[PDB]
Structure formats: structure tokens, C-alpha cells
Design a protein around this ligand. Structure first.
Ligand code: HC6
Ligand code: HC6
Lengths: 348, 306
């Protein structure tokens, strides 16, 4: 798929000016660009040298262009992670978007999240991620801050179409402001270390790296850090566990399927946290009685913060049903998370 | 407002001091400082927010103007500047900054209207040079002067070079370059020319105009050769292994390049200073600095016969 003429010309000039080597002297007519994703916001494109053009040095043959359609911290964050080799290299940054490394890879599917070697490696990459120092605020205000913010906007929504007004009423019927306070009180008393969290560690943000599909522990990369921040570790792990249940690649409306039965088993959760804990801390040296005590408390911790994943992204999805024009069943998804919230709450 | 910044961003928890940190009260500059901190070429970045940022406090002092000519300082600044020029950065590599900023300030200068009469007179003397005509002579000259576009500091002066406390007896690693607010992809000759110009200017004078200019303190040819003899192997991997003849070819051609681009330091900072005299609330003789830079511009033209 070819972008429209203005984009191709803007893309061309960003590459030509930001990228070194053969890129600097490329003609418009030589420029190769194709759409990875369209839409009004965050369109992605692969830009490329002709195959017949030689590179002069260690410039890339292709790059990813991200057009937008917190900009400071998101940018600084992307730059630091690029420096640290935890994300894609940053080649250019500008008001309209970025030029990034093109990583030959595909995203994991939802079903691959339960594969033990995959899970174990997600565990490890996440632990690593949680261990880094980042020049942002270390006070854990993101979770209930963000939730408070969405609840206020949700409370002020007036829908005009019937099926939407129907859905909003049912969700409103639970007394979300009250339910938020109980949730806050549950987690108030649930210790969780504040660490630098991805906050959206899902299959859509984990790349299965090309070549390394034979590799057991080194075939993955976490990407798309827009929600990242210092936050309770339990949310990051709990949110990941919830993501086993959500498939955002379904092709008919509402364009996701939720399956409560696909939440990891205790056996599965334990397999995750058992990779995470020695990766994060040494831990293999503790007594198996202390290691179980720690593991068991973590399970409760992460399953309790799981509830914040349901509440936050449920609230988020209601806001999106109002302000977003993307083709997704945002209200159906709101209900699904709130269903899962009450189910999980009833399990606990 | 800043006690909180430390409580929240730092983990026991204008420019101020606070183990010890520095607070400084934008996307490009932030990314840039973050990258340089990551690569240990800058002070560590501990905090970043809208109203400022928390940085590492580095026990040091700035160099003095007179120290730029110490052979060892001069040699290390060359090395450090070479290193800086070798960096990749996610920024535009088309060299827009130099003439873009001169045009920017020229346009402003051509519509500055001062209130005070002495500033009116001083500006009148400066506009008597026909600054737009002269920018075109500079453009013409520099466009015929090949100079590689590199990542330039663009303000490599004594006030932005730390002498690191406890490293004073080190012959080659006692300095750090800071303050990258003017840094951009630019002609290399500008960064070197500007630094050469900076041997003449002392911004620490305690009495009005609050600088000194000594034109006799511009580096001599030997002093300049010493600088570039250190710059060149630092920056060019194959340079040390070249013939003594091929080396001198490059040096001689480099001397012409840097001394030609030095004219742009004088012209840019000359224009910058007229604009500052209008807008700045700092106490400094901006108009007298303007005049010193343009005097030095025409003097240098005459030196070079251009
Ligand atoms: C192909 N269509 C039918 C039209 C084009 O967009 C879609 O491809 C599409 C795919 C995925 C999504 C999607 C929605 C929400 C999320 C999310 O994980 C984002 N958050 C994690 C922020 C909140 C929870 O839901 C991920 C993907 C939305 C639309 C659906
Ligand atoms: C490189 N540039 C960007 C252009 C050339 O001039 C500069 O190097 C420059 C640097 C420092 C100063 C400067 C300004 C104010 C002061 C002072 O301390 C003087 N007083 C003591 C009078 C009051 C407070 O400000 C000292 C140095 C002025 C210009 C800045």
C-alpha cells in the first residue's frame, strides 16, 4: 500500500535530511515507502533505499516512520531506551513524528503468551525493564491518577446513539466512583514495589525477532512505551496476565474477543513469577520456605493489581468510545473488562 | 516548588545546588542531554519536567579565558571537540543552523528600535556596515570553503569547559564540555573558528561592559597548528598513519577553513548581541560586544585578504 502523495514527499524529506549515507543524496523518484498502518493517527510506514543503492557506511537500508497525526518525556524515554539497546534505535525526531529502526519481526499472538519459554522470557524482559533508572517521577501517582482522570470524563459523557447510551447506563449502574474507592482501599493495603513499568505489556507490544525463533531466552523485545511510568510492579504483571484473555485481532465487530478461561492458571502464574524473581533479584539463594512465602504473596499482589487493569482500561475504553473514531467496539470492550473485574473480584 | 522535584525524582530523598544535584530552570534539547548523559559525554540526567531539570553536580570550575592557550588544555579541548563531532544524533543533518540563525537575527536587528540614545547611536554605527550586503559576502566566501557537516557544540568556550576537580594533574583527561543549548549539525570549521575567536573574549570582567576583548590573544599559527594536530587524529581514524606531507596538506587547508568560518562566529554573535541588548535583562554591555565582534570581523577579513 502506497501512502498518499503529500506523505510520500514529507517522508522523503525527513529521511533524506535525518538519515546519513546514501540517504542524503537520494532522489524523490528513488525513494521507497509503503504503509504499515493507516488512519487519522499513528500511521506507520516503512521507508527504504532501492535494492540497487549501496550504503556508504552503517546507515540503515530501511527505517520505520511514525507519524503522530508528554511529547518530551515520551521522546526522552524512547531515546534513553534506544541508547540502552532495549528499544529500536532513534534516527530522527521531529514535531510530526519519528524515524526508527526497522526490526524484522512479527508481534506475538495472544495464544503465544502462555507458551512457557515465551512467558519466562517476557518475565525476564519485564524484570530488566523494572530495574532501570529513568529520569521521571518516582511517586506512584499514574495508576489512580489516570483512573481518577478517566472517571471524571466518563461521568460527563452524553451519548446520542441508542446502543451506546444503553451500554453506558449499565456500566454507570455499578457506581464506579464507589467501586473505585473500594479498589483503592484494596490496593492501599497490598504492598507492591514502585518500579519503572511498561504498563501495556501485551502481545501487540512484544516482537518475536526474526532469526532468533530457535533461541529459547532471547527471541523478544518489548516496544511501545507510551503508557510507561513509575508504577506498582503488580500492575505491570497483573495487566500482562489479563492480556492473556484479550485478543485484539478479531476481524468482525467489536474487533476483539475476551475469554475469561484464558487467564493464566496458578501453575502458569508461578512459572512467570519464578523467571521474574531471580531476574529482578540472588533470589535463587533464599530458602525454599522463604522463596514460597515471597512467591505466594506476589501472586496475591499481582492478582489484586490485575483488578486495576480491568478498571483502568475499562474506564479508558469508555472515554475512547466518545473521543476516538477508530473502528473498534470500545463499549463492548468496557463491559468485557468490567465483567472480568467482578468475576476476578469474586474469585478473590 | 523545587524541594518537591527532589523528593519525587531522586531516590534517601537559574541554577541551584541541593548526594548533591543541580537544578536548571524543548523536546530536542532534552533528548540531546539525555543521549549525552547516556553516553557519559554529559552530566547525568536525574530528573526532567516542564519547568526545568535535575542534573549531576560535577565538582569542577570553569576554565579561564587565559587557560585556553595552555598546550595541554588546548590539546584536550581538540580531542573532546573531535569526539563530540563524531556523534550521531537524531537531528536534522542538513546544515541550516549557521546562516539560518544569522538571517534570523539580521531580520530582527533590521527592525530593532532602541529607546536609549546611546544604543541608538551604537546601532547606527553597526548598520553603517550594510549588514545584509556583508552577510552575502560571507555566504559567498563560506560556500566556496569546503567544511564537513558534523555535530557541533557551537559555543565551545571557557565558560562551558569544566576543569574536573581531582584531575588537574592529568595531562589528557581533566576537562568536560558542557551547555549544549546551541548544539546542532553545522560546519566543523564554525566550531573550531568560534573556539579560536573565544581566546579573545573574557566574559568575567567585573566592570562594564563586563567583558574584555584582546585581539592580540587570537591563537598564533603555531597555536592553531597544535590545536588541529590534536583535533585531526581524534576525528579522522586514518590520519595518524598518513605521510608527513599529506598531513601538512590537510592542516594547511584546515587552517584556511577554520579562519574563514571564524568570520561567521563574529558575524553571528555580533548579530546575536544586538538582539540581546534589546530583549535581555542581564547586566552586560551587549552593544559594546557587538562592536568588538564586528571590529574583529573586519580585522580578520583584512588578515585573510578576503
Ligand atoms: C481492523 N479494524 C476492524 C479496524 C482498524 O483497527 C483495528 O484493526 C483495531 C485493532 C486493534 C485495536 C486495539 C484496541 C485497543 C487496544 C488496547 O490494548 C490499548 N490499551 C492497552 C491502551 C487499552 C486496552 O486495549 C489494542 C488494540 C483497535 C482497532 C480493527
Ligand atoms: C556564546 N554566546 C552565546 C555569544 C557570545 O557571548 C556569550 O559567550 C556570553 C557569555 C556570557 C555573558 C555574560 C553575561 C552576564 C554576565 C554577568 O555575570 C555580568 N554581571 C556581573 C554584570 C551581572 C550578571 O551577569 C557574565 C557573562 C555574555 C555573553 C554567549
Amino acid at each position: 500500500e502506497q501512502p498518499e502523495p503529500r506523505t510520500r514527499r514529507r517522508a522523503y524529506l525527513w529521511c533524506k535530511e535525518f538519515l546519513p549515507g546514501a540517504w542524503r543524496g537520494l532522489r524523490e523518484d528513488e525513494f521507497h515507502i509503503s504503509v504499515i498502518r493507516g488512519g487519522l493517527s499513528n500511521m506507520l510506514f516503512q521507508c527504504s533505499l532501492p535494492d540497487t543503492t549501496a550504503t556508504l557506511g552503517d546507515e540503515p537500508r530501511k527505517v520505520l516512520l511514525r507519524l503522530y497525526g508528554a511529547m518530551v518525556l515520551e521522546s526522552v524515554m524512547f531515546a534513553i531506551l534506544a541508547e540502552r539497546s532495549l528499544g529500536p534505535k532513534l534516527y530522527g525526531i521531529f514535531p510530526q513524528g519519528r524515524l526508527e529502526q526497522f526490526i524484522p519481526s512479527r508481534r506475538l499472538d495472544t495464544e503465544e503468551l502462555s507458551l512457557p519459554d515465551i512467558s519466562a522470557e517476557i518475565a525476564e524482559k519485564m524484570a530488566t525493564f523494572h530495574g532501570m533508572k529513568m529520569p521521571f517521577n518516582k511517586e506512584p501517582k499514574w495508576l489512580f491518577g489516570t483512573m481518577e482522570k478517566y472517571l471524571k470524563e466518563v461521568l460527563r459523557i452524553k451519548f446520542t446513539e441508542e446502543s451506546r447510551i444503553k451500554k453506558l447506563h449499565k456500566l454507570l449502574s455499578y457506581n464506579l466512583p464507589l467501586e473505585l474507592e473500594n479498589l483503592r482501599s484494596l490496593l492501599e493495603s497490598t504492598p507492591s514495589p514502585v518500579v519503572f513499568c511498561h504498563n501495556d505489556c501485551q502481545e501487540g507490544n512484544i516482537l518475536l525477532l526474526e532469526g532468533r525463533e530457535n533461541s529459547e531466552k532471547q527471541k523478544l523485545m518489548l516496544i511501545d512505551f507510551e503508557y510507561s511510568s513509575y508504577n506498582y510492579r503488580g500492575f505491570d504483571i497483573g495487566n500482562h496476565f489479563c492480556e492473556w484473555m484479550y485478543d485484539y485481532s478479531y476481524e468482525k465487530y467489536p474487533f476483539f474477543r475476551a475469554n475469561i478461561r484464558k487467564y493464566p492458571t496458578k501453575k502458569q502464574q508461578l512459572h512467570f513469577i519464578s523467571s521474574y524473581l531471580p531476574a529482578f533479584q540472588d533470589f535463587e539463594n533464599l530458602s525454599t520456605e522463604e522463596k514460597s512465602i515471597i512467591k505466594e504473596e506476589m501472586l496475591l499482589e499481582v492478582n489484586r493489581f490485575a483488578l486495576a487493569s480491568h478498571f483502568l482500561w475499562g474506564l479508558w475504553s469508555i472515554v475512547q468510545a466518545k473521543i476516538s473514531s477508530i473502528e473498534f467496539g470500545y463499549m463492548d470492550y468496557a463491559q468485557a473488562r468490567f465483567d472480568a473485574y467482578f468475576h476476578q473480584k469474586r474469585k478473590l
